[PDB]
Ligand binder design. Structure first.
Ligand code: ZN
Ligand code: ZN
Lengths: 10, 183
């Protein structure tokens, strides 16, 4: 159940 | 665990797989997840077919939904593995969404448009056009690649990506369905 947060970036 | 979503290559709140480095937005995983899992969680690509280690909090698992007609439990997992494999491949980005409606020639030429967002939706039993057999899934994937080869110039980046991703797909199809010929 690990979560992380990463800076968001024919 | 990787830093960006395996599917959309963006950041934000990302659920980590317990068994591989991949991380996912809840709605980018196939099937999409309706909540963050409380405990052990293993992604569709890692989850064992035979003994399922966890059922997912997804639309198809809801009480009112799992009685509806659709793919068998076994075929649902196999087809989800095939479709998520497509979505996680770097070559797949041009196929995630429909071609822009501004593409005049595309829609004059391609009479049966297909993309991975349609395929994702039809894996859900509540969709009016929901899949009932793996053959229908494979047929839509192959239609998507046929449209790509029909429209794009053979030497273009997108044409090459389509041909190469199709080769990867047909390889995965033989891995996941070793005894079933989709001819
Ligand atoms: Zn994502
Ligand atoms: Zn995994």
């Amino acid at each position: 159940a690990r979560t992380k947060q990463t800076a968001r970036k024919k | 665990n990787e830093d960006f979503c395996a599917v959309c290559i963006n950041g934000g709140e990302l659920l980590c797989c317990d068994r591989c480095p991949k991380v996912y937005h809840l709605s980018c995983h196939v099937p999409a997840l309706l909540s963050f899992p409380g405990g052990e969680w293993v992604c569709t690509l890692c989850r064992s077919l035979t003994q399922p280690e966890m059922e997912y909090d997804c639309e198809n698992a809801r009480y009112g939904v799992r009685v509806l007609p659709g793919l068998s439990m076994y075929d649902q997992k196999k087809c989800e593995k095939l479709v998520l494999s497509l979505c996680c491949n770097s070559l797949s980005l041009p196929f995630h969404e429909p071609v822009s409606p501004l593409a005049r020639h595309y829609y004059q030429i391609i009479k049966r448009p297909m993309d991975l967002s349609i395929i994702r939706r039809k894996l859900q039993k509540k969709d009016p056009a929901h899949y009932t057999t793996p053959e229908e899934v494979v047929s839509d994937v192959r239609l998507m690649f046929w449209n790509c080869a029909k429209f794009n110039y053979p030497d273009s980046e997108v044409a090459e990506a389509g041909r190469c991703l199709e080769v990867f797909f047909e390889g995965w199809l033989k891995e996941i369905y070793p005894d079933k010929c989709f001819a």
